[PDB]
């Protein structure tokens, strides 16, 4: 019972290419509470609405989260015309999704910052990430890029963005609706 969002509140969130995926079945959730624990800067959805995704019953709910600087919002909007959707993280198009950009407030003291934001700028002929999967280069690219420009090959090149005062993160949600299995519901 009650969906277990606790693991997000403790630790250093991974970089975008190492996104952490939490799967929820048979549990009631409260997303509005989770988001109230943050300063929410952006909240867009595909094939569902912010209101609907906090108030619907699903067969499973998937929450991805990672460190992501709010200044790279453009790099998400560009979609497959840029490295993030090409090489790091790209949400399903067969299921409704949302992507949320958030700053962790000073008062929520138990989310730990990494040395910087990092992402894969190239990973190869090119090896693009398929919707909902990890980059083939997840093995060789380090948890954090050391210096903007590193070239790992066993060909994966990393980039960096300086750390902000307060950690900025991204949350990706994918819901799946079933038949006779929609038992991830909002609590009332």
């Amino acid at each position, epitope marked *: *019972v*009650e969906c277990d*969002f606790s693991p997000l*509140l403790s630790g250093t969130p991974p970089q975008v290419y190492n996104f952490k995926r939490l799967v929820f079945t048979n549990c009631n959730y409260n997303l509005t*509470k989770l988001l109230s624990l943050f300063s929410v800067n952006d909240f867009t959805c595909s094939q569902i609405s912010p209101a609907a995704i906090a108030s619907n019953c699903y067969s499973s709910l998937i929450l991805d989260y990672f460190s992501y600087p709010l200044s790279m919002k453009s790099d998400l909007s560009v979609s497959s015309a840029g490295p993030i959707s090409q090489f790091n993280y790209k949400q399903s198009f067969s299921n409704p999704t949302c992507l949320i950009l958030a700053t962790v407030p000073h*008062n929520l003291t138990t989310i730990t910052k990494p040395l910087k934001y990092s992402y894969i700028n190239k990973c190869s002929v090119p090896q693009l990430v398929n919707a909902n999967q990890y980059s083939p280069c997840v093995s060789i690219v380090p948890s954090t890029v050391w210096e903007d420009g590193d070239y790992y090959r066993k060909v994966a090149s990393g980039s960096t963005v300086a750390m902000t005062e307060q950690l900025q993160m991204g949350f990706g949600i994918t819901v799946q609706y079933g038949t006779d299995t929609n038992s991830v519901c909002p609590k009332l």
Partner: nanobody, 127 residues
Framework: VQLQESGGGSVQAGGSLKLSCSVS????????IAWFRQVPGKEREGLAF????????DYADSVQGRFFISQDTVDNTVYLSMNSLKPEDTATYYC??????????????????????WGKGTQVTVS
């Protein structure tokens, strides 16, 4: 939801004191109940917390194995048996509720940031 502390007062240097927190108004059964304190001029400190899918508890590390958060089986009132009380333990002790249960260990580490319902506090002074 309504929360009220009691049981405080003057404690001997070294003695123990049991505080309570009557809980009304909760409809579901999943939520966080925490215990806090604040000596004046300073910020609220998190102490102990309860989680109600199972009853798991934890305690901030400055009261480890001295303060013991319990909950009544039938009353759903939460207790706080405190032991080895030092003057540094003198504060106004607040009781706090939240709307879900995973919001707990965090607010216990962040002076009640995510807590929703609060009591007026009771006073504990150790000599």
């Amino acid at each position: 939801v309504q929360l009220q502390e009691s049981g405080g007062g003057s404690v001997q240097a070294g003695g123990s004191l049991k505080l309570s927190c009557s809980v009304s108004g909760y409809t579901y059964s999943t939520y966080c109940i925490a215990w806090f304190r604040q000596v004046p001029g300073k910020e609220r400190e998190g102490l102990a917390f309860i989680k109600n899918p199972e009853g798991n508890t934890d305690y901030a590390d400055s009261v480890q194995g001295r303060f013991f958060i319990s909950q009544d089986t039938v009353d759903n009132t939460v207790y706080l048996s405190m032991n080895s009380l030092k003057p540094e333990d003198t504060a106004t002790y607040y009781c706090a509720g939240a709307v879900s249960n995973w919001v707990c260990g965090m607010s216990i580490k962040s002076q009640g940031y995510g807590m929703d319902y609060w009591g007026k506090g009771t006073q504990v002074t150790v000599s």
